[PDB]
Write a protein that binds this ligand. Structure first.
Ligand code: MN
Lengths: 60, 168
């Protein structure tokens, strides 16, 4: 968790650029992204956590 | 109310610390979590910082206390953010209970080494024995030195920056 944090802060731009340009590895790169959300406060989430917390009525 | 957003972890196996006064049993455990280089969970840490603000902001800017003839006070000075010395005095001169109404002349973020952990325990004890346990500000203590001696970095390493706003 802590080594990833350091990494991400330094190189998140490169990962985001990779999503944009690399048409094949988007599938894996997307799981490396981390974002702040309205229900994580000052912490960040993987997109996969967003999903595990989705309500059964959310379809997006 | 970031505390009531839950997101509890207990990776530390930490007891719940309520908005009521922190139990001495945990405080003893916390001192052991410093013997073991172990840290508090975030919701408890936020909750104590909220309560610490609420009590401290009402205390008089000059503290006034009457020491009865038969009563004795132990007075303490600069600690440079090392808990080891206070670990021992608490164990040596009696734990900082009502029978050990200590006064501490600040200088805890004076240097960073265990300094988060130092104020984090002192601020624990201050809630349990507020009448007996008295904390002053030190003279090496402002954002200017919280930066120079890397305490701001300790906070930003262990926690997201909003924690540093709350500590401020
Ligand atoms: Mn000092």
């Amino acid at each position: 968790k802590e080594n990833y944090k350091k990494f991400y802060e330094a190189f998140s731009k490169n990962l985001k650029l990779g999503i944009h340009e690399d048409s094949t590895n988007r599938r894996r790169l997307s799981e490396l992204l981390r974002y702040h959300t309205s229900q994580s406060g000052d912490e960040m989430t993987s997109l996969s956590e967003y999903v595990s917390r989705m309500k059964e009525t959310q379809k997006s | 109310l970031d505390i009531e957003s839950m997101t509890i972890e207990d990776e530390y196996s930490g007891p719940k610390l309520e908005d009521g006064k922190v139990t001495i049993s945990f405080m003893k455990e916390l001192m052991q979590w410093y013997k073991d280089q172990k840290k508090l969970h975030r919701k408890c840490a936020y909750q104590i910082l909220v309560q610490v603000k609420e009590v401290l902001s009402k205390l008089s800017t000059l503290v006034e206390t009457t020491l009865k003839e038969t009563e004795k006070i132990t007075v303490c000075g600069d600690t440079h953010g090392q808990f080891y010395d206070l670990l021992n005095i608490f164990e040596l001169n009696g734990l900082p209970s009502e029978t050990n109404p200590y006064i501490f002349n600040g200088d805890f973020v004076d240097r960073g080494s265990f300094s988060v952990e130092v104020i984090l325990t002192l601020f624990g004890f201050k809630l349990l024995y507020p009448d007996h346990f008295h904390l002053l500000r030190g003279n090496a203590e402002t954002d200017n030195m919280n930066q120079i001696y890397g305490f701001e970095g300790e906070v930003k390493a262990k926690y997201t920056a909003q924690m540093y706003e709350l500590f401020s």
